[PDB]
Amino acid sequence: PRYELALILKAMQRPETAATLKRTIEALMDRGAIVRDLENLGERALPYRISAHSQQHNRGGYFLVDFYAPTAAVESMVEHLSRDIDVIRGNIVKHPLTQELKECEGIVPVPLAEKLYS
């Protein structure tokens, strides 16, 4: 299915950041993934201090990888990200754009009797 990898990378210089992304996208491809896009969300201060691989982090590079992969690739990729020392935190979620939002007419009133009755 289509997944979205939210990738927080250790704050590094451009050459080491590009090497980490290439090494990360190749890991997806090695597991059968079809990579669709790579987005840079920018380097920012983390919302809290994160300890990863015997180091404390206050800043990180936020990246997104939109890709398709078999269901068995997720488990193996999560394991790969846990061992890469340049990744602060990596999470794979089902791509939000796959889920179609159902239309809403509005806020139907709910009878108060049901509230206390329920």
Binding site: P1, G32, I34, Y68, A69, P70, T71
Partner: protein, 171 residues
């Protein structure tokens, strides 16, 4: 199981699907989909193989095939999840519901009942007449009563030869 390269049931009959890039074929195959999509391909394979009208989904045959695919998925699920009591219940309930379907198909259309059993590999079994615990005392006694019967039969045959032998001597 169908090959992973198999296209999805929705994209198999679109014109020009055989001339698209290989990448597009991977994205429309079973490899890039969840298991439920592979089960829709399995159900369609059994429908064409068994039922007379592959598009009649409300016939007793189609329901047996649809439920038989669900039953196989639960078995694979429970092979990896052996403490999943929720799905163990769903499996046992699904087996019971199919047996009820097979019972009703056997009574109404035997020729179709036979094709469903051959196609799906189902060995129909008649239910036991009595439901009662076979506890240790009964299991042990029933075994002894069978041994006693077997021994009595042997003794009754050795009382046929001796009588036969003595009768011949008189002559």
């Amino acid at each position: 199981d169908p090959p992973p390269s198999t296209l999805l049931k929705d994209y198999q009959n679109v014109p020009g699907i055989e001339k698209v890039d290989d990448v597009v074929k991977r994205l429309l195959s079973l490899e890039m989909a969840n298991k439920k999509e592979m089960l829709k391909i399995k159900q369609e394979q059994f429908m064409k193989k068994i039922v007379a009208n592959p598009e009649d989904t409300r016939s007793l045959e189609a329901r047996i095939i649809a439920l038989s695919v669900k039953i196989r998925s639960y078995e694979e699920h429970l092979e990896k999840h052996r403490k999943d009591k929720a799905h163990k219940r769903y499996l046992l309930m699904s087996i019971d519901q199919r047996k009820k379907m097979l019972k009703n198909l056997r009574n109404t259309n035997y020729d179709v009942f036979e094709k469903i059993c051959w196609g799906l590999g189902i060995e129909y079994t008649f239910p036991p007449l009595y439901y009662r615990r076979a506890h240790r005392r009964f299991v042990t006694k029933k075994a002894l009563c069978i041994r006693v019967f077997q021994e009595t039969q042997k003794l009754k045959k050795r009382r046929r030869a001796l009588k036969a032998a003595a009768a011949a001597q008189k002559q």
